[PDB]
Amino acid sequence: ADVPAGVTLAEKQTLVRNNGSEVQSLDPHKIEGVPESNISRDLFEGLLVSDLDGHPAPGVAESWDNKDAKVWTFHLRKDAKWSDGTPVTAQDFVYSWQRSVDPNTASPYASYLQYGHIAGIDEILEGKKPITDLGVKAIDDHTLEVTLSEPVPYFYKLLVHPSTSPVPKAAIEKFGEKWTQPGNIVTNGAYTLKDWVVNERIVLERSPTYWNNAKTVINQVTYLPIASEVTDVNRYRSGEIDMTNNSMPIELFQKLKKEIPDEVHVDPYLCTYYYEINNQKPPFNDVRVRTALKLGMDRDIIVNKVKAQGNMPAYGYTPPYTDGAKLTQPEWFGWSQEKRNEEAKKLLAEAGYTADKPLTINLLYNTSDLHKKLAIAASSLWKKNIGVNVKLVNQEWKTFLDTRHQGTFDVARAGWCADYNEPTSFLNTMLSNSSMNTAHYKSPAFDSIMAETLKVTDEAQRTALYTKAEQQLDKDSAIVPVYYYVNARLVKPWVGGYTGKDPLDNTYTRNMYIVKH
Template identity: 35%
Template sequence: MSVSTPRPIQSWLRLAAVATAGALLLAGCNLFGNGGAGVEDDDEDGGGTAAQAQGGHITVQVTNFAHIDPQSITFGMWLVQMGLLEGLVLQTPDGTDVRPGMAQDWDVSDDGLTYTFHLREANWSNGEPVTAEDFIWSYQRLLDPARGTGGIATGDSSYQANLGILNAAEYNAGIVDDFDEVGIRALDEATLEFTLAAPNPGFIMGLTYPSMLPLNPDAVEGDDSWQQPENWVGNGPYNLVDWVSNSSMRLERNPEYWDNENVALDSIDVQLIEQGSITTTVPYESGEVDIQALAEPAEVTRFINDPDLSEHLILLENSGTTYVTPLHSENTILQDQEVRTALNLGLGREQIAGISELTEPAATLLSPATPDWGEDLATHEQMWGDEAVAEAQRLLAEAGYPDGEGFPNLTLLAGADFPQLDAIVDTWQTNLGIDVTKDVVEVGVYVDRRYDTHDEDYFGLWYGSFSGISTWPYQVQQLWDPNMTREAGLDIDSYAELLEVQSDESLSSSERTETVEQIRHDGTEPLAREFAERVLDAQETVDENEQQEILRDAAAIRERTELFLPVVWNSMYYIAQPHVQGLELRAQADRYYFKDLWVDEDA
């Protein structure tokens, strides 16, 4: 395959994506199946199963946030997704399929390029009808170039360019300046049509991402006060009635919601917990909290080993990957593939995973829950153990650092302190003889440092974790996507040039985008470029099996770049009181919908 010249810029724009959780291809579904396929609900409209048990109240814990605009990256967009707003479709409780939401059904053209959604009769919480034009207004706001292209930092646009909507990424980048050229239009008040640039079997699942939620135009126009309870207008099963900043929220059932009869809970109290804070289960065990994530390894172990408390556990296995990736530094040692390989094989993954019930040693970036995952995807036959360490030591010696002698002090950057950090430091010291220093900083500083350039004295890797749906397009196109991978493979000079171009206000949006793409193509490592090319190849087929095969090949190439070194796979434990019914965890970051829950006081 020739990779000497980049493909047209429009092709690469479709690969831009954020690294928080999104959703794409449906495992086990027809490539272009019509609406409702695979849905198993108690009512024909795809509603919940809770009508038999209406009433009740629960208290839940979620990560704190500053705002709840779903078109900007923040933990608040997930709370909105859980029940304040509703999009065209929702995921099924286990996250493997979709069910009708605002769209009661949909049609797909034979060529897989046109999706037509038929809206049900539904109202906003103020009693006004939800129309196709409301969705158009929302998407034009989302794609406004002034909001910026999709990113991963708090405040970035949440748009997912790999939905592949015709000219959407181009409009967002300023290359196309007329929104009428974007492949979204209202055929009438109840019909919404999308046109894609290329077939995308994951498009419908992608609509379940928070960025694609509709907003009420009249409520949102103006300042951010529309997010306050007194001004809130939503179309989801619950309304926002109270919000104490950094403390709590209260949600109450929305009587205007189209499927209100299948919404069980009358109200929900939301406790807002700071990210990275150590949470206690005392309120849960005293009955003050009904649902919370269980993140402390000692607490997980205690619940697992307690015959009574173990009944409260709900597990989502291997829902995310913890990894490390090189910083861009004037110290160029990590641009040497053999040095990265030595670090990869020298990681004591078994020891790192062994410190917590929440983790397993990771052979690949991809979760093993991904259909047709196999150990053959791993870069090396032995990713840990004595043989791997011996090979790591040999490679490090060949690079000029026998037993780590002369290897500069390695920095491990993180946005919060985790037990795995100390284990990584210890295993690299033990296995390779290199010194590693943790640099744990506030999240905002962490984001800045991991995307900045550094001098020779600041050299190392940053620590991160991604979680999301275990499907091939999501795991390959969304997480560690082609743009992120190619940028990780840039040499320091090319990366510095890329940052300079991105901040150059004298360039038009289209000039900036085209120049950045040329830098990504020309300056990156060959394998990173090959990976991106294979992802584009996957977009050129309408055959689901062929696409999966190409994406699987692309994933294996990405592993071979060793630009992202997998450390452990993370499992997610939640605890729920026995009277809480209907809770099933999904891999997407919202985890579950409030609509699916009900209370059985006899349980």
């Protein structure tokens, strides 16, 4: 943290914040959700980290170079240590990245390093070659060489993501699946695990072994797993939470803008709210049925329920304000809702679903006051607009994510946040082979377009190819886009270091401090 001169720090340097749900795991290779990453960024530090403006900055790697954006050499700082006193070495990153792509690890972020296209990754992920063939090697203890199969100038932006953090070989081989237990875990972040009580709290305490511990201010941070946005807000107002989750309850947000405007932060957020179609669950294997759902959803009615936050209606998957995206709105977005509804009922009727023989689907969503309200709305809209019956199923955050991977759902409330500020961070999730493809979308045409992005001469072509992928995704109605997120949360006036200028919202407890109150 960088405390401004003249600012008086408080006696007690503690922070409470709501994470929004109970985390999948504290194992960096066993997570895929934003809540999981919020804790991982405090516990584990990768090669690069996000600065206050969201730009890649030095982490364990103090400098780095590249040749043709193909061979990346990372120079690791020599005072980089684990929580057991052992130094963080290039070998840790070889082991860690080899583990992440091991079929036996079964990481949901297995395909992440495949977005960087590290040498020999393709055959390793499908279990044809061994993990030791991966194009990452320890040239020495403090020098890591990453060899890629094609040029990727945005490779370095990937390396802020927790699924790219080092993981301690000793602890994992000693404790197995018990390696993240409070007493056992070994961390290289600014914090280590003090306590973990399921559905109550995760307590981290400042790790003195951290190389930059001299600049850490917050001694202890608590993450709460409160799914109810109403309860989060109420506990914040009762003075028990310092920072809410960035999910605001539809009903109270207008009240909160009026009463505590100074404490209400709303900033750009590279995430898309959408209704994810299981493309392999009948009748959603039919593109006509999928298109009927896409058109039959009224975004304007839905967006007007969250108007106070100022969400823009969504016409695609990749946020158009994503760095290197010049997206075009599809013709159907320009139509009236009455015209979308007619065309949707026609397309349904072609597939043999009419008023007389109706379509009944299950809309899955993760426990939430925001998601329940917008689901009831969406359910009602689809019923009046295109005569589709929509029953609501709710599950806890962990089960929700599992259900979508297994493909045991019809349509799920979905929300993707960019891991790095580049359209591939989104678009690569819809690749046939991607471990993050919970849509189960398989288009050789879409895969072909994305493969073409790595054979490009200038960035102007790369941007155009991304727009063609978004168009193909839209033509195949892979998803029902609803609205592009904003980063809206409540932050007590005594919490400093939160600027909200990072559009990925990759904040670190080590960057924050408590002003006297």
